[PDB]
Design a protein around this ligand. Structure first.
Ligand SMILES: Cc1cc2nc3c(=O)[nH]c(=O)nc-3n(C[C@H](O)[C@H](O)[C@H](O)COP(=O)(O)O)c2cc1C
Ligand SMILES: Cc1cc2nc3c(=O)[nH]c(=O)nc-3n(C[C@H](O)[C@H](O)[C@H](O)COP(=O)(O)O)c2cc1C
Ligand SMILES: Cc1cc2nc3c(=O)[nH]c(=O)nc-3n(C[C@H](O)[C@H](O)[C@H](O)COP(=O)(O)O)c2cc1C
Ligand SMILES: Cc1cc2nc3c(=O)[nH]c(=O)nc-3n(C[C@H](O)[C@H](O)[C@H](O)COP(=O)(O)O)c2cc1C
Lengths: 173, 173
């Protein structure tokens, strides 16, 4: 079983990335092969100028091809996903998520814009042909107590993450 | 009267940018001060890693502050605007478009996704507090005859552009 995790925040460390950190740990407890990527792992000029011959993109697309699922996280920037994350999604082959389960995760300042980022991400993931897009976990900033050390969440957010991850695990089989 | 034009495509030249090229020409005929920017005018590492101390961002935000209107163009990538364009929008101050008229332009492969990019751009421009977001011009690729030489459009697309630009000009007063 193989899963890719992808951090869409251009900050290091990152609040949305702390949800991914918790996921990877849950998953490694389950004997899942996890490959974690963030935007530092690509040359910025390749991403900004959509250079499809990017070496790192080749590796990333090869790892994603073998993967059964993708967990992708983003901050809410200007009522949507980060542009930095979108630069990489734009460079993925057509059908890149065909046959795969996608769990979206996000953190944001306001609940209204957490609804907005959910609505904005879905058509993009559908354009990549994701087999199923799970409901996901969209949490306001106050729900993350610590994203600099060991991730710490409110009980509500930890429960929502655990549910989503169990749903993700089952959807993979 | 001052207008910023902003090309969101990471390609040079670009089909969506040819609509901007036509706009800038119409506008310079009207005695409008036009400042044109594209993603080559920023350091890619500043955009991908959301570096708010970017020197070019400072200049761009200063020119935009003095501007009365913005014409922004994007390709349709994965049923939305380009991530490359979003990386720059993400770096604009809150309220960056307060008091300003915005004309969105886009080119894409399919009509269905031209509706999608219209719906995706609006909340982002609203998050930047644009005073009015014009209907805009969203054209499929077959409507651009030439974007490498002097821009050439089908009569239908040229008419739609001329209408939109007249609407933009009036909205500015
Ligand atoms: C440039 C920038 C733009 C933001 N725009 C929004 C917004 O439009 N709506 C909102 O609710 N939160 C907004 N936020 C708050 C972030 O979504 C929130 O703090 C998020 O948890 C940051 O996640 P990260 O640490 O993983 O980058 C913005 C933050 C930044 C830095
Ligand atoms: C609703 C909301 C919207 C925000 N929008 C922005 C924005 O558009 N640009 C920005 O620089 N910060 C924005 N912020 C603030 C960032 O969260 C704040 O600057 C934080 O200290 C950034 O830290 P970071 O870069 O580590 O994420 C927003 C915050 C909230 C709650
Ligand atoms: C990476 C990439 C992704 C694209 N994704 C879409 C899409 O999801 N839906 C669509 O209708 N057209 C899609 N297209 C076609 C472009 O929107 C269209 O060719 C556009 O005119 C290119 O504009 P530009 O020359 O200004 O970059 C895509 C093109 C590229 C290069
Ligand atoms: C609906 C539609 C969707 C497309 N989606 C993609 C895509 O996701 N990735 C890509 O590389 N090309 C995509 N293309 C194709 C590009 O338009 C094509 O590769 C073109 O030759 C790219 O030229 P350009 O990079 O100069 O824009 C799409 C085309 C259409 C009509």
């Amino acid at each position: 079983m193989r899963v890719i995790t992808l951090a869409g925040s251009p900050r290091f460390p990152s609040r949305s990335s702390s949800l991914l950190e918790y996921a990877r740990e849950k998953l490694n407890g389950l004997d899942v092969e996890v490959y974690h990527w963030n935007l530092q792992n690509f040359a910025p000029e390749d991403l900004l100028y959509a250079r499809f011959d990017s070496p790192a993109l080749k590796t990333f697309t090869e790892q994603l091809q073998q993967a059964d699922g993708l967990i992708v996280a983003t901050p809410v920037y200007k009522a949507a996903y980060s542009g930095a994350l979108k630069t990489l999604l734009d460079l993925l082959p057509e059908r890149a998520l065909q046959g795969k389960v996608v769990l979206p995760l996000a953190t944001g300042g306001t609940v209204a814009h957490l609804l907005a980022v959910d609505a904005a991400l879905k058509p993009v993931l559908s354009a990549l042909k994701a087999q199923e897009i799970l409901h996901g976990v969209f949490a306001d900033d106050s729900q993350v107590i610590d994203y600099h050390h060991r991730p710490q969440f409110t009980p509500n957010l930890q429960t929502r993450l655990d549910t989503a991850l169990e749903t993700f695990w089952q959807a993979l089989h």
